[PDB]
Amino acid sequence: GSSGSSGSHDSRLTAGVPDTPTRLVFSALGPTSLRVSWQEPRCERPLQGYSVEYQLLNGGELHRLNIPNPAQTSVVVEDLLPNHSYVFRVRAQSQEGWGREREGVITIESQVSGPSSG
């Protein structure tokens, strides 16, 4: 219909940003090793990379991991503490900016051989 509007100049706002990614996948290669994998979220613009921030659930040191590859949807986290929870918050970045991030905490469990058939 008719044209013409009035108001702030909010149009270039971050819209092509990557939507919150899906749950994460932990491998736990070991007591001091792990592997977080996410799912390429929706984004009108091509992603430039990813960010995997992890830190003691309770509250300790926060380590930010940058991904120079927008295709690599998986990273191996090592140098962790045994029997300690870590909040792994994965985030995505696109030509626009940083979108949402998925929360995923893991509990290092050593000396566990699953169930026992009998």
From Swiss-Prot:
Sequence positions bearing Phosphothreonine: T20
Location in or out of the cell: Cell membrane; Cell junction, Hemidesmosome
Tissue: Integrin alpha-6/beta-4 is predominantly expressed by epithelia. Isoform beta-4D is also expressed in colon and placenta. Isoform beta-4E is also expressed in epidermis, lung, duodenum, heart, spleen and stomach.
Residues annotated as domain Fibronectin type-III: 20-112
Post-translation changes: Palmitoylated by DHHC3 at several cysteines of the membrane-proximal region, enhancing stability and cell surface expression. Palmitoylation also promotes secondary association with tertaspanins.
UniProt subunit comment: Heterodimer of an alpha and a beta subunit. Beta-4 associates with alpha-6. Interacts (via cytoplasmic region) with COL17A1 (via cytoplasmic region). Interacts (via cytoplasmic region) with DST isoform 3 (via N-terminus). Isoform beta-4a interacts (via cytoplasmic domain) with DST (via N-terminus). Interacts with RAC1. ITGA6:ITGB4 is found in a ternary complex with NRG1 and ERBB3. ITGA6:ITGB4 is found in a ternary complex with IGF1 and IGF1R. ITGA6:ITGB4 interacts with IGF2. Interacts with TMEM268; this interaction prevents ITGB4 degradation.
Disease involvement: Epidermolysis bullosa, junctional 5A, intermediate: A form of epidermolysis bullosa, a genodermatosis characterized by recurrent blistering, fragility of the skin and mucosal epithelia, and erosions caused by minor mechanical trauma. JEB5A is an autosomal recessive, intermediate form in which blistering lesions occur between the epidermis and the dermis at the lamina lucida level of the basement membrane zone.
Function comment: Integrin alpha-6/beta-4 is a receptor for laminin. Plays a critical structural role in the hemidesmosome of epithelial cells. Is required for the regulation of keratinocyte polarity and motility. ITGA6:ITGB4 binds to NRG1 (via EGF domain) and this binding is essential for NRG1-ERBB signaling. ITGA6:ITGB4 binds to IGF1 and this binding is essential for IGF1 signaling. ITGA6:ITGB4 binds to IGF2 and this binding is essential for IGF2 signaling.
Family, as annotated: Belongs to the integrin beta chain family.
Protein name, entry field: Integrin beta-4
Annotated organism of origin: Homo sapiens
Taxonomic lineage: Eukaryota, Metazoa, Chordata, Craniata, Vertebrata
Name of the encoding gene: ITGB4
